Amino acid sequence: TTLLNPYFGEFGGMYVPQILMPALNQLEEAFVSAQKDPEFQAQFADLLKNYAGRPTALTKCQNITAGTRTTLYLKREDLLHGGAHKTNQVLGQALLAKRMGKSEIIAETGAGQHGVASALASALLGLKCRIYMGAKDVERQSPNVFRMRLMGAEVIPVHSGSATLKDACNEALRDWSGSYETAHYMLGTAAGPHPYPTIVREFQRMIGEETKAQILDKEGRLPDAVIACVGGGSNAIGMFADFINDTSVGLIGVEPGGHGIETGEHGAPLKHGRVGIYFGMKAPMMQTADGQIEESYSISAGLDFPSVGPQHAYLNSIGRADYVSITDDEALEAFKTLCRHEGIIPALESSHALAHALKMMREQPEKEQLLVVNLSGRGDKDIFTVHDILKARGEI
Amino acid sequence: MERYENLFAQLNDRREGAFVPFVTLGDPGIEQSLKIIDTLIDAGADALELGVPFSDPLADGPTIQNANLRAFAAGVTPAQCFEMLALIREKHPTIPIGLLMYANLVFNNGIDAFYARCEQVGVDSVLVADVPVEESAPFRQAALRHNIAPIFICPPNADDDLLRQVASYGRGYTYLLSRSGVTGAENRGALHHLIEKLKEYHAAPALQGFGISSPEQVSAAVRAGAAGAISGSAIVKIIEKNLASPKQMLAELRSFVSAMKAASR
Ligand SMILES: O=C(NCCOP(=O)(O)O)c1ccc(OC(F)(F)F)cc1
Ligand SMILES: O=C(NCCOP(=O)(O)O)c1ccc(OC(F)(F)F)cc1
Numbered sequence: 001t002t003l004l005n006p007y008f009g010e011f012g013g014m015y016v017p018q019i020l021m022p023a024l025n026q027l028e029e030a031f032v033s034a035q036k037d038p039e040f041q042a043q044f045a046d047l048l049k050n051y052a053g054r055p056t057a058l059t060k061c062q063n064i065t066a067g068t069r070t071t072l073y074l075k076r077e078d079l080l081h082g083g084a085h086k087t088n089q090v091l092g093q094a095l096l097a098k099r100m101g102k103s104e105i106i107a108e109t110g111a112g113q114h115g116v117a118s119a120l121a122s123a124l125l126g127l128k129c130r131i132y133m134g135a136k137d138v139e140r141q142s143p144n145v146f147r148m149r150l151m152g153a154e155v156i157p158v159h160s161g162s163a164t165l166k167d168a169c170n171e172a173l174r175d176w177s178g179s180y181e182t183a184h185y186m187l188g189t190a191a192g193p194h195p196y197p198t199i200v201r202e203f204q205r206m207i208g209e210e211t212k213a214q215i216l217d218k219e220g221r222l223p224d225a226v227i228a229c230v231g232g233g234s235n236a237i238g239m240f241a242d243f244i245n246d247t248s249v250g251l252i253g254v255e256p257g258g259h260g261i262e263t264g265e266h267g268a269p270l271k272h273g274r275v276g277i278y279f280g281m282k283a284p285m286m287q288t289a290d291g292q293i294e295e296s297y298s299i300s301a302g303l304d305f306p307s308v309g310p311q312h313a314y315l316n317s318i319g320r321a322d323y324v325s326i327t328d329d330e331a332l333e334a335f336k337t338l339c340r341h342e343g344i345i346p347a348l349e350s351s352h353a354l355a356h357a358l359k360m361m362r363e364q365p366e367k368e369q370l371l372v373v374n375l376s377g378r379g380d381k382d383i384f385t386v387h388d389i390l391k392a393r394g395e396i
Numbered sequence: 397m398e399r400y401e402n403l404f405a406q407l408n409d410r411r412e413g414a415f416v417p418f419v420t421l422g423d424p425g426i427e428q429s430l431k432i433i434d435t436l437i438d439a440g441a442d443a444l445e446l447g448v449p450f451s452d453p454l455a456d457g458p459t460i461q462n463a464n465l466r467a468f469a470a471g472v473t474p475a476q477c478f479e480m481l482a483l484i485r486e487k488h489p490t491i492p493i494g495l496l497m498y499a500n501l502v503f504n505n506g507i508d509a510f511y512a513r514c515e516q517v518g519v520d521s522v523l524v525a526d527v528p529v530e531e532s533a534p535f536r537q538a539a540l541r542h543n544i545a546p547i548f549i550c551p552p553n554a555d556d557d558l559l560r561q562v563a564s565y566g567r568g569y570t571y572l573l574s575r576s577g578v579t580g581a582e583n584r585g586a587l588h589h590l591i592e593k594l595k596e597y598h599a600a601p602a603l604q605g606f607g608i609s610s611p612e613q614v615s616a617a618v619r620a621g622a623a624g625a626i627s628g629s630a631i632v633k634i635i636e637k638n639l640a641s642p643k644q645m646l647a648e649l650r651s652f653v654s655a656m657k658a659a660s661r
């Protein structure tokens with residue numbers, strides 16, 4: 001029995017051990033209560049405005065589109081405190097944890113980004129934060145690990161399984177199954193068991209709400225399409241949500257194609273995986289023919305997650321959103337192009353969305369189209385990654 | 397086939413509890429797992445709970461996490477697991493055999509096809525660790541269609557609605573959960589209210605699991621009204637400790653199961 005629908009068509013659900021259902025049911029009730037509570041909404045809005053810096057700008061990119069009939073705006077989540085959109089929803093979930101009387105936060109992290117966002121929200125709101133990170137990810141994300149520790153979070157390396165994101169996820173759930181009376185599990189994307197896909201969407205939907213208001217103010221009409229990268233699905237569903245009922249507005253999600261779909265070294269389960277049940281949810285995932293959970297790949301660690309949020313799988317199945325992929329090399333070119341022509345260093349995650357918009361422009365340069373790319377984060381964190389690739393291929 | 401019902405009636409006729417070990421199929425290898433399983437039976441195991449190696453066993457503590465990795469190091473696949481299951485049943489016609497599965501391995505090639513394969517090799521029950529009773533409808537329907545008992549966890553917190561669902565939907569036995577958290581013999585667990593309501597609701601006989609590692613825990617579970625006890629991590633630790641000594645492993649395994657089984661009278 002739930003208050004809200006745990007499914008998006010065939011996708012979603014609550015596939016957790018029985019011992020964790022009370023924690024999910026408690027969380028759903030607290031969320032439904034909070035959504036009706038003007039005091040909660042006022043507190044959340046106040047943090048978003050005065051701490052995180054909302055609203056974020058909507059920037060018209062004139063140099064990039066010169067000579068074409070594309071008008072391209074970037075929604076500037078790179079200007080959000082923490083440098084990525086993740087900050088929006090961790091502030092909401094931190095307030096939910098307090099509404100429930102929880103004093104501790106559990107979080108999982110691969111690229112470090114959600115770990116940092118969880119740590120900063122926990123530091124601000126006086127919660128004791130512990131973060132599970134696969135040991136392989138600890139090794140290659142030492143800057144984000146240090147940020148987490150500077151913010152007072154406890155970072156716990158995970159050595160089981162493949163020592164990466166899914167193994168950190170398991171360890172977070174194992175911990176929560178015994179600690180949920182005092183700890184909240186602050187899941188980091190629009191995936192996992194219900195109610196998380198719903199909560200994370202609702203706590204990210206200001207991205208699209210603002211985008212709609214800003215584009216109407218600047219252009220007097222809705223976008224032809226809004227384009228967002230998809231690792232787990234949170235920045236994309238945050239941009240999409242307020243446009244779902246505007247049926248003229250295209251919704252385009254971009255999965256990482258890695259070295260190319262045909263190589264198998266990619267992160268595009270929605271279009272190139274197989275539906276499975278894991279991560280607490282029924283969703284497309286990368287898996288062996290036997291049903292063992294596989295490893296994804298992307299140049300961008302933030303997109304390196306072998307499943308996808310169930311609402312995206314649903315929006316795809318009914319044709320409301322379209323999903324595409326962008327390779328490492330395409331994302332790298334979009335990264336360089338934004339730096340050089342607009343003076344903005346984009347996250348390599350977001351560069352996947354930008355790369356697809358650039359393709360939409362370049363393939364049909366006389367097509368009139370008003371596009372918004374969700375610039376989900378800034379790319380300071382990526383400059384060493386981009387430097388080393390550029391030097392290895394002989395550009396530097 | 398009604399192996400759990402036959403076993404429980406026979407145990408009740410002997411005023412005896414069930415002792416049910418858990419191991420991972422193919423840990424540490426196929427041939428030595430088959431020997432492990434035959435030794436547990438020879439030492440007095442009443443029923444078996446058997447895990448199929450899975451990449452992400454999120455309901456399991458470190459001990460059984462490591463058993464999966466040992467099985468994967470040996471190349472054990474679900475297909476090989478079902479070949480083992482068929483041989484085990486061919487050797488031992490009456491012992492109830494239950495699988496501990498994660499959902500993706502059941503869903504992977506079709507839910508109905510999975511339970512059909514269980515029926516064909518002689519499996520008696522399936523517990524899907526990450527399918528709560530609220531999500532269980534397609535699983536328990538496929539199970540019953542193929543004469544497989546669907547097993548459900550009854551957690552310590554269980555409210556009356558959960559008790560009624562578990563009583564109505566489970567067959568074979570009710571998995572009575574000793575505590576919250578994950579498996580592990582390094583965290584011991586705890587009820588006369590749960591066992592009584594389950595009996596009141598005509599539930600399948602209750603077996604207590606999670607943290608059963610000492611013989612007096614077996615006697616306490618039976619004394620509390622459970623039909624017996626399941627022990628996992630405690631057995632698998634004997635496998636872990638004696639990897640380098642195959643024959644010593646079988647001997648320590650035999651001693652522990654015999655000690656545990658004796659406690660169920
Ligand atoms: O993708 C996830 N988190 C993103 C971490 O973000 P980052 O720090 O950028 O790697 C993620 C985390 C948990 C999850 O479900 C469950 F808890 F069941 F495992 C599904 C996806
Ligand atoms: O039987 C099991 N383990 C062996 C016995 O437990 P232990 O002695 O503590 O290792 C066992 C049963 C269920 C399970 O997942 C969930 F509870 F969610 F269904 C995980 C392990």
Ligand SMILES: *Cc1c(COP(=O)(O)O)cnc(C)c1O
Pocket residue numbers: 083084085086113114188189190229230231232233234235236302303347349350376377378
């Ligand atoms: C984490 C992250 C992503 C991908 O996560 P989603 O949940 O898919 O949004 C994208 N961009 C940035 C900057 C990120 O940090």
Ligand SMILES: [Cl-]
Pocket residue numbers: 007009010
């Ligand atoms: Cl459904």
Ligand SMILES: [Cl-]
Pocket residue numbers: 505509510513
């Ligand atoms: Cl099968």
Ligand code: NA
Pocket residue numbers: 230231232267268269303304305306307308
């Ligand atoms: Na993904």
Ligand code: NA
Pocket residue numbers: 164295296297298304
């Ligand atoms: Na990976």
